[PDB]
């Protein structure tokens, strides 16, 4: 009696699901064929709490002897630039305050789409993946220096 | 499973997304390993069960025949015949419960491990081939100087391929994970349900004749 | 051997359920089907005790 009762709710739940994964499947092949883009992710410069917020991957120079370049996820928040060490573990500061910063388009590096952030306490090298990501990251910082 | 994979960030490709793709896989593998342990224990019950009913049926012929050869009594001559069919009829119900048990092991559990992770793995395989491809596509794009234009263009054409087809792949992988989350409960619940149906059916066969046998 | 085999099997079936999130069906329904299964085994054991006693 428990079996057949439960079996009636059990079948209906998986009939409900069988539709469910068909909708996800149906949208995912619409997404894949028609709107699926190859350009790199681009951050969003939108106001947040504390002033301008933007977040995304950048290349930077490491403590390898050649100064070997390397990819990390960076956030601009509360007039500050931090970088992430691993996700959910706490971030590290890049510039104490961006509003005492300058942002250098750096035409003498040969490094594709490189910039340098020179602030009162601290300097840091950076690199964007694209000239679009160079001009938006340099502009997000330059607007942040103007905050 | 479903909420150990951020579907939300699969076009975005954050460290969040990368943490999730590594975290979700261990519960699929755990699960696969537990599914195999039930498919083997199930056949373990099918072999001892069947050996037990071969021993049981053979014993039932011999207990009756030994009594039939026993000294003459007319109530024993009919009663043992009532007994003989009862003894075998209860067994036939129990042979049927092994075969029902066997069919559900094929429909649910053996099917789940054989078929249900194939498409997730086919997506997972190509998705880490594209992730690996993407990581070097970006490496070779970052590490070419500005004056080496031609090498940079070759690496960025590969990246546009990698980033698109990696986005393509993250959706499938999100889909087949979302499928197994739902599927996993329903098949094991169906399997304990179809099992005890055959039990209720096997025990009713021995109860349907309980009155005549009494 | 059949009862050991069945008992190990019913332990194996429970083990699928506990790995999945806690929900009404896994937590309660699935266990109630499987404890009646261990009870049915023990009743089957009393029948092998009575087959041996009788014999």
Numbering used by the authors:
A (entry chain B): 215 to 361
B (entry chain A): 1 to 214
C (entry chain B): 51 to 105
Which sentences from the paper describe this structure?
Overall, the ACAP1BAR-PH dimer is predicted to oligomerize, both longitudinally and laterally, in forming helical strands that wrap around a tubular membrane with regular periodicity, resulting in an “criss-crossing” appearance by which ACAP1 coats the membrane. Consequently, whereas the basic repeating unit of protein lattices formed by conventional BAR proteins is the dimer, the tetramer constitutes the basic repeating unit in the ACAP1 lattice, which is achieved by the end of an ACAP1BAR-PH dimer that does not contact the membrane interacting instead with the mid-portion (arch) of another dimer, resulting in an “end-to-arch” interaction between two dimers in forming a tetramer. Our previous reconstruction of the ACAP1BAR-PH lattice did not achieve sufficient resolution to identify specific residues that mediate these three major interfaces of contacts. Thus, we initially sought to refine the resolution by pursuing a type of molecular dynamics (MD) simulation, known as MD flexible fitting (MDFF). A grouping of 12 contiguous ACAP1BAR-PH protein dimers were embedded onto the cryo-EM density map (map resolution 14 Å). Overall, Interface I is created by four salt-bridges, residue pairs E122-R125, and E122-R129, twice in each dimer pair, and six H-bonds, residues Q107-E154, E122-R125, E122-R129, twice in each dimer pair due to anti-parallel symmetry. Interface II is predicted to be created by a portion of the BAR domain in the dimer N+1 forming a binding pocket, and a portion of the PH domain in the dimer N forming a loop that inserts into the binding pocket. Interface III is predicted to be generated by two α helices in the BAR domain of the dimer N interacting with the BAR domain in the dimer N+2 and the PH domain in the dimer N+3. Overall, as the electrostatic interactions are about one order of magnitude higher than the van der Waals interactions, additional analysis suggested that charged residues at the three interfaces should provide the main driving force for the protein contacts.
